[PDB]
Each structure stands twice: as C-alpha cells, then as structure tokens.
Amino acid sequence: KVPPTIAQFQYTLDRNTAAETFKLFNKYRPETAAEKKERLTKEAAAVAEGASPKPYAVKYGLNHVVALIENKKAKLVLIANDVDPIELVVFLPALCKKMGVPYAIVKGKARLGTLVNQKTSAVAALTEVRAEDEAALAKLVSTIDANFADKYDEVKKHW
Amino acid sequence: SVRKRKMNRSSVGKATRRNKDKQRKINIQSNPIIAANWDYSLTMAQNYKKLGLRAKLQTPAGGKETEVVKKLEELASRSQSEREEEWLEKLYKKHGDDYKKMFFDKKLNIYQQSEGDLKRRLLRWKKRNG
Amino acid sequence: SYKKGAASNRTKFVRSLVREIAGLSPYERRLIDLIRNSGEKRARKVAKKRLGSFTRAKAKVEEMNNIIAASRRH
C-alpha cells in the first residue's frame, strides 16, 4: 500500500505530450564541456587580436530548481519518477502546486540526463525562453495543465 | 635491556650524536640589524635591555638609543591592464566627462558599473595618459 | 540570544507544507479523533504520557487544534 504523496508519481505524462515536451526541451541544451571549451579558445584567438546577449538553456540542479520554484522563475518543471531516495523529490510536486508553477512528472531519469549533458538529472526546468518558442512553451503549459493536472486532481487522494 | 645489549655488542656501531652545545648557544636568524647587535655572552632579557626593545609586555613574575635609531632608518624608506586602458579610451573619446550618459550607455559600458567606478578608473587613466 | 530565532517566512512555509504532505503519525491520528470525541482535556492527558513533559503536550494539542480548524472550514 502506497501513501498518496508516493504514487503521485507513476501517474506520469503520456506518450504524445512527453514527445512534444522534448521537442521543446532538446532545443534548449546546455553547451557541453567540449563545445564550451572550443568557444572560449575562439574567444581567446579573437579578443586577444581584434556584445553577446544572455543565452537560454535548461536549468538542472535540484538545489537550483528548488530555488527557481518559489523565486518564482521556473515556468515548466520536469520531474523524474525513478529516484534512488524517493524522499529527495516527494515534496517537489506539492511545492509547484503551492507556488502555482506548472510542473510535469516525466518518465525516466536518464531520459532527463540526455537533454542535459549528464547521466541522470531527477529534475529539469526551463526558466526563460527565446521569443519564437514563447507561444509554443505557453501552449505546452496549457497542454500539461489539461492532461496532467486536471485529469489527476484526485492524485492527492487514493492509496 | 635486551635491545641495547646487542647494540653495544655489535660491530655496526652507534649513531653517535653530539648536540648539547647547540641547545644553549642559539644564533639569531630573523633580523640583520639584531644579528650584528646581539651579545651571545649575555642572555635573552639582558640583550633586549642592551638594545632598548621590550622583551616582555606583561609585569614579569620574580625580580630583576644606538640600535633602535637604525630601525627607524629602515622605516623612512599598481597600473591598469591593456584591455582596461583601451576600453577607457573608447569611453572618453565617445562621451568626454558625462558619467551619467557613460553608465546608461550599453555598447561600450557592458558591465553595468556605477558612476563612481568609471570615474575613478578614468582618473587613473588621466594620470598615465592625457 | 540577540539572534534568538525570528519567524522566517520560508521556514514557516516549509514546516506547514511538510506537516500536511507527511500526513499524521499513529498517536496523532488517535489524538485528533480523541479531541473531537473525548474533548481537549483527555487529549492533553494522552499526549503528556506519549511525549516527555506537559509543556510539549500543550503546544502539540494547540497545533492539532490549528490543523483541524483550518482543514474543515478553509
């Protein structure tokens, strides 16, 4: 028997919505260690001989995400269900519901790791966005709130 | 003793160390003016009174300026980077001395520093240059 | 104690958030029912026996009163 705050997970986001979430999220990769290093050597070769705006990426640290929700800066928050200590993330759907930040439980922790240059991530969030994907993001917010939140209003109940 | 009996018996020898004279006559090491003016025949406290300098700052338990002037003798006797200087050249030639315009500027003053920061660095720039 | 331990909006939020998400412990599950049926008098008796001192049991029963009143109404 599962106490309602556990198994608020497993009632995860479905097939098509999850695919569309990654269609958005895979656009916003953090610049990998190799890519970042080569860019700075390009900067070294250029600026030593002879401007840029703030670049948007996903935010992916548990401490960083728990900061961003309640900041409030997070817009979408993805949460993996499979976590070795489950108690690490059990409060997080409640925190998002309380602060009114739209969240989604995604399926697979390594699935979050792929979009983020890590092995696993447990939580991923998209704070800010480029102007072109703004309408698409807000549409996905409504899509997730209709599919995830409104269908499973009774997820806080039932063992 | 068991082990000591062998060491006296063996043809290996003992690691003979004569280091009892050095435990008393310690050379001063940290000041050259003192290194010249320090009578080793005298003690620690007697050497301090001979110099002038205090050996103890508290009221001591129990009972009891040629050099100090030379210490007062030795008491009698930072630029900006290339990018920083060249960046300040860009600001000065653009605005002049309008620091309000200079910090509300976006293209040249990228890191949004205050009026006080920019003007201080310009004062240092105006010393090395015009 | 100049730095005694001020309210701190964040800490108050976290404590009350966990207070509901965790649910209720078996003695507290018994205790809240014991308030509604046997009154606050016998509730303080059981809480004093369960916990260490009476000074703990006062603030505990007071916390239960706040939980019950805020749940049913709002």
Partner: peptide, 26 residues
C-alpha cells in the same frame, strides 16, 4: 487532502536582492 497548497502562493519565499552578476556578461 491537498490542504495548504490549494491556497496558491504570491510573493516568492525570500526577499534577497539579485546581484549585478546576473546582468552584465559573466
């Protein structure tokens, strides 16, 4: 029963100023 979270939050839980390091390029 999702009691406390039904009353949805307004100001963030802190009041910390946000530094100049989160504006001019890093």
């Amino acid at each position: 029963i999702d009691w406390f979270t039904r009353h949805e939050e307004v100001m963030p839980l802190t009041a910390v100023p946000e530094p100049k390091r989160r504006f001019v390029p890093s």
